[PDB]
């Protein structure tokens, strides 16, 4: 029942009207590396972005647009969200299921796994 909301100084609109997403970032499918999928991340909900009339740069009014936090475990992120009074959605970690790989299978005598090239 810890509540730091009064002490944080965050204005009430972002405390109440923002949904924070707790998740482990998925691997960038362009790369096979997995080092960026080992820590939980807290990200706020996306808001409106509009073009500046003068230059066309994207302007925002969301202070927490770029705020992202790293947490070792899901429970730590949940506790931080609760202590800060942010509504939170938790996406369970997705792990690659174990696979059975056999280089011999590429030359099966009767199975369809034989590779044409």
């Amino acid at each position: 029942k810890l509540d730091i909301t009064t002490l944080t100084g965050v204005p009430e609109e972002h405390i109440k009207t923002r949904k924070v997403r707790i998740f482990v970032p998925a691997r960038n499918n362009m790369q096979s590396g997995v080092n960026n999928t080992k820590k939980w991340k807290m990200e706020f909900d996306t808001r409106e972005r509009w073009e500046n009339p003068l230059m066309g740069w994207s302007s925002t009014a969301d202070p927490l647009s770029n705020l992202v936090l790293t947490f070792s475990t899901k429970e730590d992120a949940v506790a931080f969200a609760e202590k800060n009074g942010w509504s939170f959605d938790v996406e369970e970690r997705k792990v690659p299921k174990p696979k059975s790989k056999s280089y011999g299978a590429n030359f099966s005598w009767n199975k369809r796994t034989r590779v044409s090239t």
Binding site: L54, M55, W57
Partner: protein, 176 residues
């Protein structure tokens, strides 16, 4: 290893006492300072006659950014966005699309000279020597908006200053 400033004891002999009494009563040290100022008065002043005389600068000077071209005339920048990444003040905004010829070119290259810190990055990062801070420094503007450069403004600056910029790069390209 260490030296004592102060930590000196005045002599108590009558000659030294008379000298110090003379200094106090006859204002000798004040006269010495006055003489120093007089000598500086008779020395040649160091002022340069700006704008008719300009202060020295080296070829590595970092001033107004200027997009350069190849000798053929094709714009050097190849939309790598490496400059935007290194930019320590995020003053570079780059947008690119394949142009009609099919080359990788920048549809938008904005350098906000109001947010840039003139760090010299990008000039040292661009793999094709595109953005190169020019020698110009006297580009003050009467409105804030004039300092938000556009790709057209950068290319015009490059065309204007290419004669000097190429020479400066030639002077310094071996050190880089």
């Amino acid at each position: 290893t260490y030296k004592f400033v102060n930590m000196r004891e005045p002599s108590m002999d009558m000659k030294s006492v008379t000298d110090r009494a003379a200094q106090t009563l006859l204002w000798t040290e004040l006269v010495r300072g006055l003489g120093m100022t007089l000598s500086y008065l008779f020395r040649e002043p160091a002022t340069i006659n700006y704008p008719f005389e300009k202060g020295p600068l080296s070829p590595r000077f970092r001033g107004e950014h200027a997009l350069r071209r190849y000798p053929s005339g094709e714009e050097r920048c190849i939309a790598c966005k490496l400059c935007e990444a290194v930019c320590p003040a995020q003053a570079i905004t780059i947008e690119a699309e394949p142009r009609a010829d099919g080359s990788r070119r920048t549809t938008r290259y904005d350098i906000d000279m109001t947010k840039c810190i003139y760090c010299g990055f990008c000039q040292e990062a661009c793999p094709v020597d595109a953005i190169v801070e020019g020698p110009n420094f006297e580009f003050s503007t009467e409105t804030h908006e004039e300092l938000l450069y556009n790709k057209e403004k950068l290319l015009n600056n490059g065309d204007k200053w290419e004669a000097e910029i190429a020479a400066n790069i030639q002077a310094d390209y071996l050190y880089r």
